[PDB]
Amino acid sequence: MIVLFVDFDYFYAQVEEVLNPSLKGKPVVVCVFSGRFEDSGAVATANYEARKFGVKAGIPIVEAKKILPNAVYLPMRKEVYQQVSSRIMNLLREYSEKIEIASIDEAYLDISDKVRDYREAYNLGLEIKNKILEKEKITVTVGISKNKVFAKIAADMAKPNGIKVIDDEEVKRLIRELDIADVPGIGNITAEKLKKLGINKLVDTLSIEFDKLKGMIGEAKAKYLISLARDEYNEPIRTRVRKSIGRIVTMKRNSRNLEEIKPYLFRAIEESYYKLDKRIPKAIHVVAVTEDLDIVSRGRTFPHGISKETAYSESVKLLQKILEEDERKIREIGVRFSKFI
DNA sequence: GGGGGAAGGATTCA
DNA sequence: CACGGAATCCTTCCCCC
Ligand SMILES: Nc1nc2c(ncn2[C@H]2C[C@H](O)[C@@H](COP(=O)(O)OP(=O)(O)OP(=O)(O)O)O2)c(=O)[nH]1
Ligand SMILES: [Ca+2]
Ligand SMILES: [Ca+2]
Ligand SMILES: [Ca+2]
């Protein structure tokens, strides 16, 4: 198997540049303005000019402002980025039927029976890059290896605007040298549990009793890590399909007042339905974010599809159930639909 | 004992 | 001060043969 992974560079910020070239060169910060107060909200991402000073995805807009008060701040326009993304995805399809769209800016191509050895794979990388850059003026980073995981690791290593191959030889090498935290799917929580077990590199998962590892991080995560340790990871490139659709909004102020909360909720329902289009869900969950930034939810699955009418009243109950099972005020309210017919 | 879901949360990544 | 969107996995509770 020969996997070629593509990851678009500082994607949202780069799209804003393509659409408004005068922005290129200076720091650009794409933000999610929550509407609470003046600059309430977080950063979705920022171009590298901005990252040089620590402004990156996830930090409060206010903190970014302190660092770069003169940077350009733009509201996130998700739908725009999506269409450009879709176009780039259609271009990659011209390189392989076997394609797995992982996110708005990521894709795995199974180019096994489309090229032999890594030399040809790499060159397919350059072609793909060059093509995308000429067709959409978007630079991306390419990662190539024997499976999705090391292909993605390949890309993380070459960012930004790069291309890299991790051949059968380096795969073996990284299994012994690569900090396990750098492995896709190992976040802060899992990294710490591994540390406390003494597991620092993929290789270490091989000398520990499975049941031990299993008990601390889960059977799934344990098999995953060992699988990679034994160069036995080979998940196929497959098409993914949306499984849930929803919306969540930040209220103007915290509240436990049903009447005060409902309009935001209903708004969340209306928007979610528009995004559902032809899809009919059988499950609905009401999601609330407490005053202390905590997340609580209540849902329900029906034996049939849910009409918008059924969503409204059912979602009101769930919200009442949330309020009557958690004393904290609510800060953000939303809904999610799943189990599509 | 264990097959088969469903509900609420944990964790991760974009 | 702390955004939106979403997938997979885990524990727990049920119903039943
Ligand atoms: N709203 C929101 N969107 C995010 C967040 N993180 C990532 N995104 C979106 C916008 C990013 O441009 C896009 C791609 O994510 P990456 O994790 O690939 O970041 P980006 O491509 O901007 O930079 P990169 O060159 O990959 O290091 O996903 C986030 O924390 N909040
Ligand atoms: Ca990216
Ligand atoms: Ca990405
Ligand atoms: Ca990590």
Coordinates of C-alpha atoms (C1' of nucleotides) and ligand atoms in Angstrom, one line a residue:
Chain A
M1 CA 0.0 0.0 0.0
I2 CA 1.2 3.5 -0.9
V3 CA -0.8 6.4 0.7
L4 CA -0.5 10.0 -0.4
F5 CA -2.0 12.4 2.2
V6 CA -2.9 16.1 1.4
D7 CA -3.4 18.8 4.0
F8 CA -4.2 22.4 2.9
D9 CA -1.9 25.1 4.4
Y10 CA -3.5 27.5 7.1
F11 CA -6.6 26.9 5.0
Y12 CA -9.3 29.4 6.1
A13 CA -6.7 32.3 6.3
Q14 CA -5.3 31.3 2.9
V15 CA -8.7 31.3 1.3
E16 CA -9.3 34.9 2.5
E17 CA -6.0 35.8 0.9
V18 CA -6.9 34.2 -2.4
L19 CA -10.1 36.2 -2.3
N20 CA -8.4 39.4 -1.2
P21 CA -4.7 39.3 -2.2
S22 CA -3.9 42.7 -0.6
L23 CA -4.0 40.7 2.7
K24 CA -1.1 38.5 1.7
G25 CA 2.1 39.4 3.6
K26 CA 0.5 40.8 6.8
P27 CA -0.9 38.7 9.7
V28 CA -4.4 37.5 9.1
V29 CA -6.6 36.0 11.9
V30 CA -9.9 34.3 11.1
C31 CA -12.2 34.5 14.1
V32 CA -15.4 33.1 15.5
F33 CA -17.1 36.1 17.1
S34 CA -19.5 34.7 19.7
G35 CA -21.6 37.8 19.8
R36 CA -21.6 38.0 23.6
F37 CA -19.5 41.1 24.0
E38 CA -17.1 43.2 21.7
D39 CA -14.4 40.7 20.9
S40 CA -15.8 37.6 22.6
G41 CA -15.0 34.5 20.7
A42 CA -12.0 32.4 19.6
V43 CA -9.6 32.2 16.7
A44 CA -10.4 29.5 14.0
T45 CA -6.9 29.9 12.6
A46 CA -4.3 32.4 11.4
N47 CA -1.7 32.7 8.7
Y48 CA 1.9 31.9 9.5
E49 CA 2.7 35.6 9.7
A50 CA 0.4 35.7 12.7
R51 CA 1.6 32.4 14.2
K52 CA 5.1 33.7 14.5
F53 CA 3.8 35.6 17.5
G54 CA 1.7 32.9 19.0
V55 CA -1.7 33.8 17.5
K56 CA -3.2 30.4 16.5
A57 CA -6.4 28.5 16.4
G58 CA -8.1 28.2 19.8
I59 CA -7.0 31.3 21.6
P60 CA -9.4 34.0 22.7
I61 CA -9.7 36.8 20.2
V62 CA -9.0 39.2 23.0
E63 CA -5.6 37.6 23.6
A64 CA -4.7 37.7 19.9
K65 CA -5.6 41.4 19.9
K66 CA -3.2 42.1 22.7
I67 CA -0.4 40.5 20.7
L68 CA -1.3 41.9 17.3
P69 CA -3.7 44.8 17.7
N70 CA -3.0 45.8 14.1
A71 CA -3.4 42.4 12.5
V72 CA -6.3 41.9 10.1
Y73 CA -9.3 40.2 11.9
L74 CA -11.9 38.6 9.7
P75 CA -15.1 36.7 10.6
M76 CA -15.1 33.1 9.7
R77 CA -17.0 32.3 6.5
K78 CA -17.4 28.5 6.6
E79 CA -19.5 28.1 3.5
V80 CA -17.0 29.9 1.4
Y81 CA -14.1 27.7 2.6
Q82 CA -16.3 24.6 2.0
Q83 CA -16.9 25.3 -1.7
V84 CA -13.3 26.0 -2.4
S85 CA -12.5 22.8 -0.5
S86 CA -15.0 20.8 -2.5
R87 CA -13.4 22.0 -5.7
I88 CA -9.9 21.0 -4.5
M89 CA -11.4 17.6 -3.5
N90 CA -12.8 17.1 -7.0
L91 CA -9.3 17.8 -8.4
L92 CA -7.7 15.1 -6.2
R93 CA -10.3 12.6 -7.4
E94 CA -8.6 13.0 -10.8
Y95 CA -5.7 11.1 -9.2
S96 CA -7.5 8.2 -7.6
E97 CA -10.9 6.6 -7.3
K98 CA -9.9 5.3 -3.8
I99 CA -10.2 8.6 -1.9
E100 CA -10.9 9.4 1.7
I101 CA -12.0 13.0 2.6
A102 CA -11.0 13.3 6.2
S103 CA -12.1 17.0 6.9
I104 CA -12.7 20.3 5.2
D105 CA -9.0 20.4 4.3
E106 CA -7.6 16.8 4.4
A107 CA -7.7 13.8 2.1
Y108 CA -6.1 10.5 1.8
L109 CA -5.6 9.0 -1.7
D110 CA -4.8 5.3 -2.2
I111 CA -2.4 5.5 -5.1
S112 CA -1.2 1.9 -4.8
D113 CA -2.3 0.6 -8.2
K114 CA -1.7 4.0 -9.7
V115 CA 2.0 4.1 -9.2
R116 CA 4.9 1.8 -8.1
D117 CA 7.6 2.6 -5.6
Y118 CA 8.0 5.9 -3.8
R119 CA 9.9 7.8 -6.5
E120 CA 6.8 7.8 -8.7
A121 CA 4.5 8.5 -5.7
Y122 CA 6.5 11.6 -4.7
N123 CA 6.3 12.9 -8.3
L124 CA 2.6 12.4 -8.2
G125 CA 2.8 14.6 -5.1
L126 CA 4.4 17.5 -6.9
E127 CA 2.0 17.2 -9.8
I128 CA -1.0 17.3 -7.4
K129 CA 0.5 20.2 -5.5
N130 CA 1.3 22.2 -8.6
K131 CA -2.1 21.5 -10.1
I132 CA -4.0 22.6 -7.0
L133 CA -1.8 25.7 -6.8
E134 CA -2.5 26.7 -10.4
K135 CA -6.2 25.9 -10.3
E136 CA -7.1 27.5 -6.9
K137 CA -3.9 29.4 -5.8
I138 CA -3.8 27.2 -2.7
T139 CA -0.6 25.7 -1.4
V140 CA -0.9 22.4 0.5
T141 CA 1.5 19.9 2.2
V142 CA 1.9 16.3 1.0
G143 CA 2.8 13.3 3.1
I144 CA 3.5 9.8 1.7
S145 CA 4.1 6.4 3.4
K146 CA 2.7 2.9 3.7
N147 CA -0.4 3.8 5.7
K148 CA -2.7 6.7 6.6
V149 CA -1.1 7.4 10.0
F150 CA 2.5 7.8 8.8
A151 CA 1.3 9.6 5.7
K152 CA -0.3 12.1 8.0
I153 CA 2.8 12.2 10.2
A154 CA 4.7 12.8 7.0
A155 CA 2.6 15.9 6.3
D156 CA 2.8 17.3 9.8
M157 CA 6.6 17.0 9.4
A158 CA 6.7 18.9 6.1
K159 CA 4.2 21.8 6.8
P160 CA 3.9 24.3 5.5
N161 CA 3.8 24.1 1.7
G162 CA 5.9 20.9 1.7
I163 CA 6.0 17.3 0.6
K164 CA 7.7 14.3 2.3
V165 CA 7.9 10.5 2.0
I166 CA 8.3 8.2 5.0
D167 CA 9.6 5.0 3.4
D168 CA 9.5 1.5 5.0
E169 CA 12.9 2.3 6.5
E170 CA 12.0 5.5 8.3
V171 CA 8.7 4.0 9.5
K172 CA 10.7 1.5 11.5
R173 CA 13.0 4.3 12.7
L174 CA 10.1 6.6 13.9
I175 CA 8.6 3.7 15.8
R176 CA 11.6 3.9 18.1
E177 CA 12.3 7.7 18.0
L178 CA 8.9 9.5 17.5
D179 CA 7.5 10.9 20.7
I180 CA 4.3 8.9 21.1
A181 CA 2.4 12.2 21.8
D182 CA 3.0 13.0 18.1
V183 CA 1.0 10.0 17.0
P184 CA -2.4 10.9 15.6
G185 CA -5.2 10.2 18.1
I186 CA -3.0 10.6 21.2
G187 CA -4.1 13.8 22.9
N188 CA -3.1 15.4 26.2
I189 CA -5.2 13.1 28.3
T190 CA -3.8 9.9 26.7
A191 CA -0.3 11.2 26.5
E192 CA -0.2 11.6 30.3
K193 CA -1.6 8.1 31.0
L194 CA 1.1 6.7 28.8
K195 CA 3.8 8.8 30.5
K196 CA 2.8 7.4 33.8
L197 CA 3.0 3.9 32.4
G198 CA 6.5 4.7 31.1
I199 CA 5.4 4.5 27.4
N200 CA 7.2 7.3 25.5
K201 CA 7.6 5.8 22.1
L202 CA 5.4 3.5 20.0
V203 CA 8.0 0.7 20.5
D204 CA 7.3 0.6 24.3
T205 CA 3.7 -0.6 23.8
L206 CA 5.3 -3.9 22.8
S207 CA 6.9 -4.7 26.1
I208 CA 3.9 -4.0 28.3
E209 CA 1.1 -6.5 29.1
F210 CA -1.8 -5.7 26.9
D211 CA -4.3 -5.9 29.7
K212 CA -2.4 -3.2 31.6
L213 CA -2.3 -0.9 28.6
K214 CA -5.9 -1.9 27.8
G215 CA -7.0 -0.9 31.3
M216 CA -5.4 2.5 31.2
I217 CA -6.3 3.8 27.7
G218 CA -8.9 1.4 26.4
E219 CA -8.9 -1.7 24.2
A220 CA -9.3 0.3 20.9
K221 CA -6.5 2.8 21.6
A222 CA -4.2 0.0 22.8
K223 CA -4.6 -2.2 19.8
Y224 CA -4.2 0.9 17.6
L225 CA -0.8 1.8 19.2
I226 CA 0.5 -1.8 19.2
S227 CA -0.7 -2.3 15.6
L228 CA 1.5 0.6 14.6
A229 CA 4.3 -0.7 16.7
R230 CA 4.3 -4.0 14.8
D231 CA 4.1 -2.2 11.4
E232 CA 0.7 -3.9 11.2
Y233 CA -1.5 -0.9 10.7
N234 CA -3.3 -1.0 7.4
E235 CA -6.7 0.6 7.6
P236 CA -8.1 1.0 4.0
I237 CA -8.9 4.4 2.4
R238 CA -12.7 4.6 2.6
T239 CA -15.4 7.1 1.9
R240 CA -16.9 8.7 5.0
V241 CA -20.4 10.1 5.2
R242 CA -21.9 12.7 7.6
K243 CA -23.3 11.0 10.6
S244 CA -24.7 13.9 12.5
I245 CA -25.7 17.5 11.8
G246 CA -26.3 20.3 14.2
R247 CA -25.9 23.8 15.3
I248 CA -25.0 25.5 18.6
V249 CA -25.0 29.2 19.5
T250 CA -23.7 31.3 22.3
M251 CA -26.5 33.3 24.1
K252 CA -26.1 37.0 24.8
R253 CA -26.0 36.2 28.5
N254 CA -26.1 33.1 30.8
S255 CA -29.6 31.9 31.9
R256 CA -31.7 29.1 33.2
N257 CA -34.8 30.8 31.9
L258 CA -36.6 28.5 29.5
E259 CA -38.3 31.4 27.7
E260 CA -35.0 33.2 27.4
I261 CA -33.2 30.1 26.1
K262 CA -35.9 28.7 23.7
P263 CA -35.5 31.2 20.7
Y264 CA -31.8 30.4 20.5
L265 CA -32.7 26.7 20.6
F266 CA -35.4 27.0 17.9
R267 CA -33.0 29.0 15.8
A268 CA -30.5 26.1 16.2
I269 CA -33.2 23.7 15.1
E270 CA -34.2 25.8 12.0
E271 CA -30.6 26.1 10.9
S272 CA -29.9 22.4 11.4
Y273 CA -32.9 21.4 9.3
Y274 CA -31.8 23.6 6.5
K275 CA -28.4 21.8 6.6
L276 CA -30.1 18.4 6.7
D277 CA -31.6 19.0 3.3
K278 CA -32.9 15.6 2.0
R279 CA -31.7 13.8 5.2
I280 CA -34.2 12.6 7.8
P281 CA -32.8 11.9 11.3
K282 CA -34.1 9.4 13.8
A283 CA -32.2 10.8 16.7
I284 CA -32.0 14.2 18.3
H285 CA -29.8 15.5 21.1
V286 CA -30.0 18.9 22.9
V287 CA -26.5 20.1 23.8
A288 CA -25.9 22.8 26.5
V289 CA -22.6 24.4 27.6
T290 CA -22.8 25.5 31.2
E291 CA -21.6 28.7 32.8
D292 CA -18.4 26.9 33.8
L293 CA -17.7 25.9 30.1
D294 CA -18.9 22.3 30.8
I295 CA -20.9 20.3 28.3
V296 CA -24.2 18.4 29.0
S297 CA -26.6 16.7 26.7
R298 CA -29.8 14.8 26.5
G299 CA -31.2 12.9 23.5
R300 CA -33.7 10.5 22.1
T301 CA -34.0 8.0 19.3
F302 CA -37.3 7.4 17.5
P303 CA -38.5 4.4 15.5
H304 CA -39.2 6.8 12.6
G305 CA -37.9 10.0 11.2
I306 CA -38.3 13.3 13.0
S307 CA -40.4 16.1 11.5
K308 CA -39.2 19.6 12.3
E309 CA -42.5 19.9 14.3
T310 CA -41.4 16.8 16.3
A311 CA -38.0 18.4 16.8
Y312 CA -39.3 21.6 18.4
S313 CA -41.4 20.0 21.2
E314 CA -39.0 17.1 21.8
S315 CA -36.1 19.5 22.1
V316 CA -38.0 21.6 24.6
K317 CA -38.4 18.5 26.9
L318 CA -34.8 17.6 26.7
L319 CA -33.9 21.2 27.6
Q320 CA -36.3 21.0 30.6
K321 CA -34.7 17.8 31.5
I322 CA -31.3 19.4 31.4
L323 CA -32.4 22.3 33.5
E324 CA -33.9 19.9 36.1
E325 CA -30.8 17.8 36.3
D326 CA -28.1 20.5 36.5
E327 CA -28.4 23.7 38.6
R328 CA -25.8 25.7 36.6
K329 CA -26.9 28.4 34.2
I330 CA -26.5 27.7 30.5
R331 CA -24.1 29.7 28.3
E332 CA -24.5 28.0 24.9
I333 CA -27.4 25.9 23.6
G334 CA -27.6 23.7 20.5
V335 CA -29.0 20.7 18.9
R336 CA -27.6 17.8 16.9
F337 CA -29.5 15.3 14.7
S338 CA -28.3 11.7 13.8
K339 CA -29.2 8.2 12.7
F340 CA -30.2 9.2 9.2
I341 CA -32.7 7.1 7.3
Chain B
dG1 C1' -23.3 -15.1 30.4
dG2 C1' -24.0 -12.6 26.7
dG3 C1' -26.3 -10.5 22.3
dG4 C1' -28.0 -5.7 21.0
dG5 C1' -29.3 -1.0 21.8
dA6 C1' -29.5 3.4 23.8
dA7 C1' -28.1 7.4 26.8
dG8 C1' -24.5 10.6 28.5
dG9 C1' -19.8 11.6 28.6
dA10 C1' -14.7 11.4 27.5
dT11 C1' -11.3 12.5 24.1
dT12 C1' -9.4 14.0 19.8
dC13 C1' -8.9 16.7 15.8
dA14 C1' -10.2 20.3 12.5
Chain C
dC1 C1' -11.8 34.8 28.2
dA2 C1' -13.0 30.1 26.7
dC3 C1' -15.9 29.2 19.0
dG4 C1' -18.3 25.7 16.0
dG5 C1' -18.6 21.3 14.0
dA6 C1' -18.2 16.4 14.4
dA7 C1' -16.3 11.2 14.9
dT8 C1' -15.1 7.3 17.7
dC9 C1' -14.7 5.2 21.8
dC10 C1' -16.1 4.0 26.8
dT11 C1' -19.0 3.0 30.8
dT12 C1' -23.4 2.0 32.2
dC13 C1' -28.1 0.8 32.1
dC14 C1' -31.8 -2.2 29.9
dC15 C1' -34.5 -6.0 28.0
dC16 C1' -34.5 -10.8 27.3
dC17 C1' -33.3 -15.5 26.1
Ligands
LIG1 N1 -13.7 27.0 14.5 C1 -12.5 26.4 14.5 N2 -12.0 25.9 13.3 C2 -10.8 25.3 13.3 C3 -10.1 25.0 14.5 N3 -9.0 24.4 14.2 C4 -9.0 24.2 12.9 N4 -10.1 24.7 12.3 C5 -10.4 24.8 10.9 C6 -9.8 26.1 10.3 C7 -8.4 25.6 9.9 O1 -7.9 26.4 8.8 C8 -8.8 24.2 9.3 C9 -7.6 23.3 9.1 O2 -7.1 23.0 10.4 P1 -5.5 22.7 10.7 O3 -5.7 22.1 12.0 O4 -5.3 21.9 9.3 O5 -5.1 24.3 10.6 P2 -4.6 25.1 9.3 O6 -4.9 24.4 8.1 O7 -5.2 26.5 9.5 O8 -3.0 25.3 9.6 P3 -1.9 24.3 9.1 O9 -1.1 24.7 7.9 O10 -2.6 22.9 8.8 O11 -1.0 24.0 10.4 O12 -9.8 23.7 10.2 C10 -10.6 25.5 15.7 O13 -10.0 25.3 16.8 N5 -11.9 26.2 15.7
CA2 CA -4.3 22.2 7.2
CA3 CA -6.2 19.6 8.7
CA4 CA -0.6 14.8 20.5

